[PDB]
Amino acid sequence: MNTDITALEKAQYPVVDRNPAFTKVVGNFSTLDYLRFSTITGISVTVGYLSGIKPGIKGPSMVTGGLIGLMGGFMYAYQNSAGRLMGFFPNDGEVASYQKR
């Protein structure tokens, strides 16, 4: 499969890595990325618990909501980290660990 990451609208910030790997993007998670992930996971677990009381399945409903929240929170954090590393988002921190390292 021929692949091409070239985006339609060019990055507006220094490109630290144009196609960062999965492990590299994950290792690039900042404290803000872990804050977004934890907030989305906690809100999802809360909604699962509160919506599950009436049917009587608050536990399993918490599990289902937490799974949805874990998926969405990881997705949001990965999005932010990869976009920073590709220069689509403000990434002064990534540029610091690039000039220095």
Binding site: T31, L32, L35, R36, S38, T39, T41, G42, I43, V45, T46, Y49, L50, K58, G59, M62, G66
Partner: peptide, 29 residues
């Protein structure tokens, strides 16, 4: 002396994490 509903305790912790994470998210953005 102790709250025994473990699912409710987990949900309380989840709500606390949501609130604290929202505060930190605002403070660091």
């Amino acid at each position: 002396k102790v709250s025994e509903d473990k699912n409710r305790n987990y949900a309380v912790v989840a709500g606390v994490v949501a609130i604290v994470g929202s505060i930190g998210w605002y403070l660091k953005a």
